[PDB]
Design an enzyme around this catalytic site. Structure first.
Site, short mmCIF file in Angstrom:
data_model
loop_
_atom_site.label_atom_id
_atom_site.label_comp_id
_atom_site.label_asym_id
_atom_site.label_seq_id
_atom_site.Cartn_x
_atom_site.Cartn_y
_atom_site.Cartn_z
N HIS A 20 6.23 10.99 -17.60
CA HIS A 20 6.81 11.64 -18.77
C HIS A 20 5.81 11.87 -19.91
O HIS A 20 6.23 12.15 -21.04
CB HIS A 20 8.01 10.83 -19.29
N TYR A 48 -12.62 5.36 -10.80
CA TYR A 48 -12.56 5.11 -9.35
C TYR A 48 -13.88 4.51 -8.85
O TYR A 48 -13.88 3.75 -7.89
CB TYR A 48 -12.20 6.36 -8.56
N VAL A 126 -1.60 0.03 -7.66
CA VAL A 126 -1.35 1.07 -8.66
C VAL A 126 -2.03 2.40 -8.31
O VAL A 126 -1.37 3.43 -8.32
CB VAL A 126 -1.72 0.56 -10.09
N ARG A 127 -3.32 2.36 -7.96
CA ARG A 127 -4.04 3.59 -7.66
C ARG A 127 -3.87 4.13 -6.24
O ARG A 127 -3.39 5.25 -6.09
CB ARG A 127 -5.53 3.47 -8.02
N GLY A 130 -0.12 5.10 -4.88
CA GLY A 130 0.34 6.29 -5.58
C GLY A 130 -0.32 7.54 -5.04
O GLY A 130 0.29 8.61 -4.99
N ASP A 131 -1.59 7.42 -4.63
CA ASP A 131 -2.38 8.50 -4.05
C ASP A 131 -1.86 8.89 -2.67
O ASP A 131 -1.89 10.07 -2.32
CB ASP A 131 -3.84 8.04 -3.89
N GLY A 135 -0.05 12.47 -3.18
CA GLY A 135 -1.24 13.30 -3.09
C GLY A 135 -0.97 14.73 -2.66
O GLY A 135 -1.42 15.67 -3.31
C1 COH Z 1 7.11 12.88 -9.85
C2 COH Z 1 6.14 12.53 -10.68
C3 COH Z 1 5.13 11.51 -10.33
C4 COH Z 1 3.72 11.56 -10.70
C5 COH Z 1 2.97 12.59 -11.48
C6 COH Z 1 3.23 10.30 -10.11
C7 COH Z 1 1.85 9.86 -10.20
C8 COH Z 1 1.57 8.43 -10.35
C9 COH Z 1 0.49 7.84 -11.17
C10 COH Z 1 -0.48 8.62 -11.98
C11 COH Z 1 -1.43 8.05 -12.68
C12 COH Z 1 0.62 6.39 -10.98
C13 COH Z 1 -0.18 5.24 -11.54
C14 COH Z 1 1.79 6.35 -10.06
C15 COH Z 1 2.36 5.12 -9.54
C16 COH Z 1 2.94 5.10 -8.20
N1 COH Z 1 3.55 6.20 -7.73
CO1 COH Z 1 3.82 7.88 -8.58
N2 COH Z 1 4.13 9.54 -9.46
C17 COH Z 1 5.28 10.24 -9.58
C18 COH Z 1 6.51 9.73 -8.99
C19 COH Z 1 6.42 8.98 -7.73
C20 COH Z 1 7.44 9.01 -6.67
C21 COH Z 1 8.73 9.78 -6.64
C22 COH Z 1 6.89 8.11 -5.65
C23 COH Z 1 7.48 7.75 -4.31
C24 COH Z 1 7.63 6.24 -4.11
C25 COH Z 1 7.66 5.96 -2.63
O1 COH Z 1 8.68 5.44 -2.13
O2 COH Z 1 6.65 6.25 -1.95
C26 COH Z 1 5.62 7.70 -6.28
C27 COH Z 1 4.66 6.78 -5.69
C28 COH Z 1 3.95 5.82 -6.52
C29 COH Z 1 3.60 4.44 -6.11
C30 COH Z 1 3.91 3.73 -4.82
C31 COH Z 1 5.06 2.77 -5.10
C32 COH Z 1 5.68 2.31 -3.81
O3 COH Z 1 6.08 3.17 -3.02
O4 COH Z 1 5.78 1.09 -3.59
C33 COH Z 1 2.89 3.93 -7.30
C34 COH Z 1 2.28 2.58 -7.53
N3 COH Z 1 5.35 8.20 -7.49
N4 COH Z 1 2.33 7.54 -9.71
#
Ligand code: COH
Ligand SMILES: [Co+2]
EC number: 1.14.14.18
Length: 210
Positions: A20, A48, A126-127, A130-131, A135
């Site tokens: 957000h 990284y 965290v990194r 999420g990648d 990704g």
């Molecule tokens: C929609 C917007 C969005 C963005 C821009 C984004 C970008 C980022 C970001 C950028 C710096 C960080 C630190 C994170 C942090 C995370 N994200 Co996202 N995420 C987002 C929504 C999500 C969603 C939805 C998942 C799926 C979770 C899953 O079950 O795999 C996700 C996966 C993750 C996970 C894996 C958690 C798990 O599955 O146990 C982490 C940690 N993240 N994310």
């Protein structure tokens, strides 16, 4: 309960704050450009490189060697992405870290020197997780909004993984099976929230000006 589920529930509030943010919302919406995307990739290469230095030190000590998979390494592919994005390899000697990226690298350097296993595992979650899960989405909208060449998007592609969804479940099971003390678990839990704040501060600094 488990460690993987606990990390996704406690850091859910902080994860909503990252998506957000002003910069990330504008970047994914298409209201910015490839220059703003390149500045994000330049700052990402700086933290990284520091993150991988800490990962290499903790893996050498034996702490979670199965979890710290060298195939997840992004700094070598991020360098090749920035060579195509900037058109030259001369970006390395002209990039300055933002105030948040400096704080981030300082934290990852402390984790490297102290060989803080649990804290490193929190930054790895965290990194890298999420990648793996977001990704392909970010690479798709970067091509749709900014026309970024697919070869300059190697950061969002993990060439050493054939089953991407299977890898996420294997990463979470390896996280759950980490033999940790109650202090090491609370240190990992409190570090996971800190690592999210660091990444949110990076977007807050990038969003200034636009
Ligand atoms: C929609 C917007 C969005 C963005 C821009 C984004 C970008 C980022 C970001 C950028 C710096 C960080 C630190 C994170 C942090 C995370 N994200 Co996202 N995420 C987002 C929504 C999500 C969603 C939805 C998942 C799926 C979770 C899953 O079950 O795999 C996700 C996966 C993750 C996970 C894996 C958690 C798990 O599955 O146990 C982490 C940690 N993240 N994310
Ligand atoms: Co600041």
């Amino acid at each position: 309960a488990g460690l993987a589920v606990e990390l996704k529930q406690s850091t859910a509030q902080a994860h909503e704050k990252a998506e957000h943010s002003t910069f990330m919302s504008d970047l994914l919406k298409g209201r910015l450009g490839v220059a703003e995307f390149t500045r994000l990739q330049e700052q990402a290469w700086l933290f990284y490189t520091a993150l991988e230095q800490a990962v290499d030190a903790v893996r050498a000590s034996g702490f979670a060697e199965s979890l710290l998979d060298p195939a997840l390494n992004r700094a070598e592919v991020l360098a090749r992405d920035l060579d195509k994005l900037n058109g030259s390899s001369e970006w390395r000697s002209r990039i300055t870290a933002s105030p948040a990226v400096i704080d981030y690298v300082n934290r990852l350097e402390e984790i490297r020197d102290n060989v803080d296993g649990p804290a490193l595992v929190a930054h790895h979650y965290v990194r890298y997780l999420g990648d793996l899960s977001g990704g392909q989405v970010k690479a798709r909208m970067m091509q749709r909004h900014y026309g970024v060449d697919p070869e300059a998007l190697g950061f969002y592609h993990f060439e050493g993984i054939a089953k991407l969804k299977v890898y996420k479940d294997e990463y979470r099971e390896k996280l759950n099976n980490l033999e940790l003390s109650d202090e090491q678990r609370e240190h990992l839990l409190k570090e996971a929230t800190d690592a999210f704040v660091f990444n949110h501060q990076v977007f807050a600094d990038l969003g200034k000006g636009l």
